[PDB]
Design an enzyme around this catalytic site. Structure first.
Site, PDB file in Angstrom:
ATOM      1  N   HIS A   1       4.137   1.347   1.936  1.00  0.00           N
ATOM      2  CA  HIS A   1       5.149   0.352   1.604  1.00  0.00           C
ATOM      3  C   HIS A   1       6.518   0.811   2.097  1.00  0.00           C
ATOM      4  O   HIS A   1       7.424   0.004   2.280  1.00  0.00           O
ATOM      5  CB  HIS A   1       5.152  -0.053   0.090  1.00  0.00           C
TER       6      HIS A   1
ATOM      7  N   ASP B   1      -2.101   2.419   0.584  1.00  0.00           N
ATOM      8  CA  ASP B   1      -0.680   2.676   0.497  1.00  0.00           C
ATOM      9  C   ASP B   1      -0.325   3.989   1.150  1.00  0.00           C
ATOM     10  O   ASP B   1       0.024   4.958   0.473  1.00  0.00           O
ATOM     11  CB  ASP B   1      -0.114   2.605  -0.923  1.00  0.00           C
TER      12      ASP B   1
ATOM     13  N   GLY C   1      12.828   5.753  -5.386  1.00  0.00           N
ATOM     14  CA  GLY C   1      13.200   6.805  -4.467  1.00  0.00           C
ATOM     15  C   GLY C   1      12.074   7.827  -4.369  1.00  0.00           C
ATOM     16  O   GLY C   1      11.956   8.553  -3.365  1.00  0.00           O
TER      17      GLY C   1
ATOM     18  N   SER D   1       8.835   7.139  -4.181  1.00  0.00           N
ATOM     19  CA  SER D   1       7.723   6.610  -3.370  1.00  0.00           C
ATOM     20  C   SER D   1       7.411   7.536  -2.196  1.00  0.00           C
ATOM     21  O   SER D   1       8.318   8.041  -1.550  1.00  0.00           O
ATOM     22  CB  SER D   1       8.088   5.259  -2.780  1.00  0.00           C
TER      23      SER D   1
ATOM     24  N   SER E   1       2.784   5.980  -5.086  1.00  0.00           N
ATOM     25  CA  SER E   1       2.812   4.579  -4.729  1.00  0.00           C
ATOM     26  C   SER E   1       3.690   3.739  -5.639  1.00  0.00           C
ATOM     27  O   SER E   1       4.583   3.057  -5.186  1.00  0.00           O
ATOM     28  CB  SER E   1       1.388   3.989  -4.688  1.00  0.00           C
TER      29      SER E   1
END
Lengths: 51, 185
Positions: free
Chosen positions: B33, B63, B139, B141, B156
């Site tokens: 993402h 992801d 932040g 991720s 994720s």
């Protein structure tokens, strides 16, 4: 930003800050919209970016 | 730069998952993402230190994404912060894990379930996710989930926060390593 599709049970964690009317910086739109919902519609968007 | 450090695209900030390689080609994994619609990645907010360019992106459904390093001088540590990573492994229920991200730093917890389905809405559904009781915030991720020297997953999404506690889902890193034919070092 439109929070109609909220709330959402999960949010991805990328950082693209928004500034809420509570002076808190929300990390992303999903985070912000869920808080709007949790506030029962009282929280609003102040401006894009950090507060 | 290492696992957990900040990375900036044209859109926002994420965290570097793990540094990996194939032959003499270095890349880094992060969240799909984050790689979706991103081309160039930088090491700083000022966008002055280039890292590389997106070579692959898989989201939703999975992801994970991979970025090829184009910066020839920046150190590419095979670690998470100072933590050495020497292999990758499959998550198991009850496994003690640790996550590192650019916003919250390092937090620990355990794997509570496997093969979870996470619906981020608007048709963004990811499958086969590792569920844990580890917190994470915007932040974080793409940051790494590890266990000792073992690489486990990539951050994720989820809910809650680090102050009051939360639930975070991670993409199994093994799947990404296999898709790209790369390995941790």
């Amino acid at each position: 930003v439109d929070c109609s599709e909220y709330p959402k049970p999960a949010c991805t964690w990328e950082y693209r800050p928004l500034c809420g009317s509570d002076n808190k910086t929300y990390g992303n739109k999903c985070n912000f919209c869920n808080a709007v919902v949790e506030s029962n519609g009282t929280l609003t968007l102040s401006h894009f970016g950090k507060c | 730069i290492s696992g957990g450090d900040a990375i900036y695209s044209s859109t926002g900030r994420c965290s570097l998952g793990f540094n990996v390689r194939s032959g003499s080609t270095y890349y880094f994994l992060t969240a799909g993402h984050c790689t979706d619609g991103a081309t160039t990645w930088w090491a700083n907010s000022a966008r002055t230190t280039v890292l590389g360019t997106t070579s692959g992106s898989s989201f939703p459904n999975n992801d994970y994404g991979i970025v090829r390093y184009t910066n020839t001088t920046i150190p590419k540590d095979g670690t998470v912060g100072g933590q050495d990573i020497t292999s990758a492994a499959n998550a198991t229920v009850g496994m003690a894990v640790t996550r590192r991200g650019s916003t919250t730093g390092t937090h620990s917890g355990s794997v509570t379930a496997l093969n979870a389905t996470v619906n981020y809405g608007g048709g963004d559904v990811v499958y086969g996710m590792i569920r844990t009781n580890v917190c994470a915030e915007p932040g974080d991720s793409g940051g790494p989930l590890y266990s000792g020297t073992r690489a486990i997953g990539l951050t994720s999404g989820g809910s809650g926060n680090c102050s009051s506690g939360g639930t975070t889902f991670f993409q199994p890193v093994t799947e990404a390593l296999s898709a790209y034919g790369v390995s941790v070092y």
